[PDB]
Amino acid sequence: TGAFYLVKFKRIPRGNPLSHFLEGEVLSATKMLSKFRKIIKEEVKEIKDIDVSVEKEKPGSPAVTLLIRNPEEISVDIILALESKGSWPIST
DNA sequence: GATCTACTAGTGATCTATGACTGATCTGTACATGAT
DNA sequence: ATCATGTACAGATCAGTCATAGATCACTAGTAGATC
């Protein structure tokens, strides 16, 4: 596909933050995205001065979308990303 | 009725598994050469 | 005139080598238990 990849680790550092997000040697995008989403919803509940809510998950989105009633409606995609300083995959 | 062996509690050293620094490798641009 | 080949330079990433926390090992006082 060139666009799509499976993510493996060389080194499980120790207990490692991301161990809970593993489905083998493979980092699970859906687990990570679910915990991310959970945290965001938790904090969003604690916002009392702004009308902000979490939008229902859109299929094919790497984001957690917020609807803000700043009277007018504003949508904010909070996109979970992994940063890699290695050289770009061959497909590029 | 006292002294040597088997076990428990307690302390502290020694050994054993993980993050940070340095050298080695890789990729590409600028330039010199050689071809039409 | 222009385009392919080889060298230096530059920056970045990757692979290989030391300080720190937890586990393990050694020794001693105190017991009980067995012997004289």
Side-chain angles (χ1 to χ4, degrees):
Chain A
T1 55
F4 296 122
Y5 294 82
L6 258 62
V7 180
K8 277 176 213 142
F9 274 101
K10 295 176 200 182
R11 315 257 88 262
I12 186 176
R14 208 187 204 171
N16 184 25
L18 321 178
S19 298
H20 321 92
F21 302 135
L22 288 162
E23 262 278 58
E25 295 227 15
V26 198
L27 186 63
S28 172
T30 307
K31 292 185 170 194
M32 212 154 176
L33 191 73
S34 292
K35 195 72 176 288
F36 198 62
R37 203 178 161 80
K38 210 266 300 276
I39 298 149
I40 290 158
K41 286 178 156 199
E42 281 186 335
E43 188 52 34
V44 161
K45 290 162 183 188
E46 291 305 292
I47 299 154
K48 324 279 202 178
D49 61 316
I50 308 296
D51 191 354
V52 56
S53 71
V54 174
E55 194 224 35
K56 188 200 76 201
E57 191 162 28
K58 317 184 212 155
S61 172
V64 188
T65 305
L66 311 171
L67 186 61
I68 299 178
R69 243 48 154 273
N70 176 224
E72 88 282 348
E73 287 155 328
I74 301 166
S75 71
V76 185
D77 305 343
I78 303 305
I79 303 142
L80 168 59
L82 313 179
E83 183 183 85
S84 176
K85 289 151 183 164
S87 24
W88 291 23
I90 53 94
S91 23
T92 64

